[PDB]
Every structure is written in structure tokens, then in C-alpha cells.
């Protein structure tokens, strides 16, 4: 459920969760880039941001 072109996961290739980087890069409500396996996972466990740690209310 990406949006955002891999243009700009070449740009900033890099993770904050899963570390390193891949391709697929989506961006959070709260202002952070995921990728789809990443913040999938994410989803599946807690809905909450990994930095900012607030909910995500949508
Ligand atoms: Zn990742
Ligand atoms: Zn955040």
C-alpha cells in the first residue's frame, strides 16, 4: 500500500525500523518513511510510532 514512487526510496534509502534499506517506502500520518513489509509488521503488532511514539489515528 505504497503511494510514494521508489524515486524517493532511492533517495533516502534507509530504515528506522527494519534498518538498512530496500524499495517499497511508505510515509506515516505522523511524519516518518516505512516500507510496506516494515510497517505492515508494524501494524500487525501496535499501531503506535516507533519514534514519536503516538498513536496513529488514521
Ligand atoms: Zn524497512
Ligand atoms: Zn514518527
Do not use: Y
Amino acid at each position: 500500500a505504497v503511494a510514494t514512487p521508489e524515486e524517493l526510496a532511492v533517495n533516502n534509502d534507509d530504515c528506522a525500523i527494519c534498518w538498512d534499506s530496500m524499495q517499497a517506502a511508505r510515509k506515516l500520518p505522523c511524519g516518518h518513511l516505512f516500507h510496506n513489509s516494515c510497517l505492515r509488521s508494524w501494524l500487525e503488532q501496535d499501531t503506535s510510532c516507533p519514534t514519536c511514539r503516538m498513536s496513529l489515528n488514521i
